[PDB]
């Protein structure tokens, strides 16, 4: 099948994700040196979109699993899960790292 070509792109995309995360952070964040709300910081257009679309980004699925946690069917189960769990690690820094 040779999935790999895009597979590489996806992680490169994950990098192209993190740059935008940084751009948001670099651009959108505060200006405390003057105790200042950064130019784009605090803008309603900014805060609403940033949080919402990230929330849009996280949307998840239900799935089966071998189990010692969660809803449970037996020591196997059904679960509510999303991309990061199997796919990719999400940072407190917002960015994404690969496993």
């Amino acid at each position: 099948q040779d999935f790999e070509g895009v597979t590489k792109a996806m992680q490169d995309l994950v990098d192209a994700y993190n740059d935008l995360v940084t751009n948001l952070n670099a651009a959108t964040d505060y200006n405390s040196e003057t105790g200042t709300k950064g130019t784009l910081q605090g803008i309603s257009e900014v805060n609403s979109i940033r949080s919402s679309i990230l929330a849009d980004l996280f949307d998840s699925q239900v799935v089966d699993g071998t189990t010692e946690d969660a809803n449970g069917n037996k020591v196997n189960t059904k679960v509510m899960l999303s991309m990061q769990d199997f796919g990719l690690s999400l940072n407190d820094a917002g960015t994404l790292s690969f496993d």
Binding site: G42, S44, N47, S48, S51, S52, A70, N71, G72, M80
Partner: protein
């Protein structure tokens, strides 16, 4: 009292109630932030995506309802941003209005 059918018969109930073996609601407009989080940790520790009447916590399906509950409450925060940001634009104009 009988006779019934395989269809409803009707009777009136009490004028008041203050606590009961009632049904379950775990999301409602009136916010209760921390106690919501308190119930959530309860379900999290056991691993409860579902509760049952017989369960030690007979009612707390915390984890699943939390997602719904949290998003509902998160929305409340969002519009408050809009009110709060709206402040600054308003007062900023006043200072501008005053300045000229």
């Amino acid at each position: 009292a009988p006779p019934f059918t395989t269809t409803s018969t009707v009777q009136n109930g009490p004028n008041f109630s203050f606590s009961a073996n009632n049904s379950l609601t775990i999301d409602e407009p009136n916010v209760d932030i921390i106690k919501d989080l308190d119930s959530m940790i309860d379900a999290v520790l056991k691993g409860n995506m579902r509760a049952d009447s017989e369960s030690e916590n007979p009612r707390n399906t915390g984890m699943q309802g939390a997602l719904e509950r949290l998003d509902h409450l998160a929305d409340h925060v969002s519009k408050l941003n809009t009110t709060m940001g709206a402040y600054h634009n308003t007062i900023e104009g006043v200072n501008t209005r005053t300045s000229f």
